Nucleic acid binder design. Sequence first.
DNA 1: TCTGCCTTTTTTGAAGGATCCTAA
DNA 2: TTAGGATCCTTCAAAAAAGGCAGA
Lengths: 152, 152
Amino acid sequence: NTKYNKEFLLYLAGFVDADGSIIAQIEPNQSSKFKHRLKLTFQVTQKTQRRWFLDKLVDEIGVGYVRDSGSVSNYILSEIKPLHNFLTQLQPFLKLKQKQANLVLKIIEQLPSAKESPDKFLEVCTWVDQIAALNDSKTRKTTSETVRAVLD
Amino acid sequence: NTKYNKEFLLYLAGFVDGDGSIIAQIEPNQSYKFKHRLKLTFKVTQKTQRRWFLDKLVDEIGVGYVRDEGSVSNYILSEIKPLRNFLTQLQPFLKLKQKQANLVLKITEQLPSAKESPDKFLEVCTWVDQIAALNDSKTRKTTSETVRAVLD
DNA sequence: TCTGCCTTTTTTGAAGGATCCTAA
DNA sequence: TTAGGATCCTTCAAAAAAGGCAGA
Ligand SMILES: [Ca+2]
Ligand SMILES: [Ca+2]
């Protein structure tokens, strides 16, 4: 558990509320127990000319990585434990994405029990739905109702 | 002056570096002495469903206003004196738009003596050029060299 | 099985301007 | 003339997903 300084988290929270994204997904997958799995991603996007800003963020957060997608680059953090540690410390300072971060934390904490009960899995999938509802969601396909249908 | 608190300025600088814009323009208009005027705008854009965020900004900055543009809204500050007071305080905390902020402050400081000679109006115009260079400029038309219709 | 990373796509929600109006 | 506001336009630079591979 890296501890992050407060002035860093305040500025970063403003920047995340603006250019960042807290993304929760349900992905069909026949080899997982309930034929789906959850993905949680913290992302900060920026034009590739300013990839230096994202490279410095990776140094400061101490985990995650930067990838180029031609025109733009993204800082990505997905690994569950460091994602939990990071969002736990950022969320107090968030204003537009606070609810999404707290949902992600709730999901992460219930993950252990999600993976042994289909109705607990479903409940967690409804929290994913709530995240997407708070985001500017436009291309989403798999929802908790997709999961419920498939569970037979 | 209105003296802003530190935690407000940290968060806002991150938000501004993300969704904000520090804009300097040279507008052609035959009724100004030099056939142009300088226009300086601090802008924060957000989707209109989140216009309450921008309304709150008016209250916290204590000047400026919010304009609905249909799909998105903008907080706008361009009145020269409060703009100068606000950017002076925000500038230290900016990381992507710090130079643009300092150019606007520099221009503002010279405006008075700008409206009193060619050569020095043109000089200020090159400082506008430099802010546009720092921005992701894509639709700019009137530059300092356009202003060389001051040539007679 | 489970997780984290890789690749790619969609559609804006921003950014960064240009131009027009009007009082004092 | 001037400052500040009002209307508008362009072109992305973001956001927010989708789908897939493979090592553990
Ligand atoms: Ca944004
Ligand atoms: Ca941005």
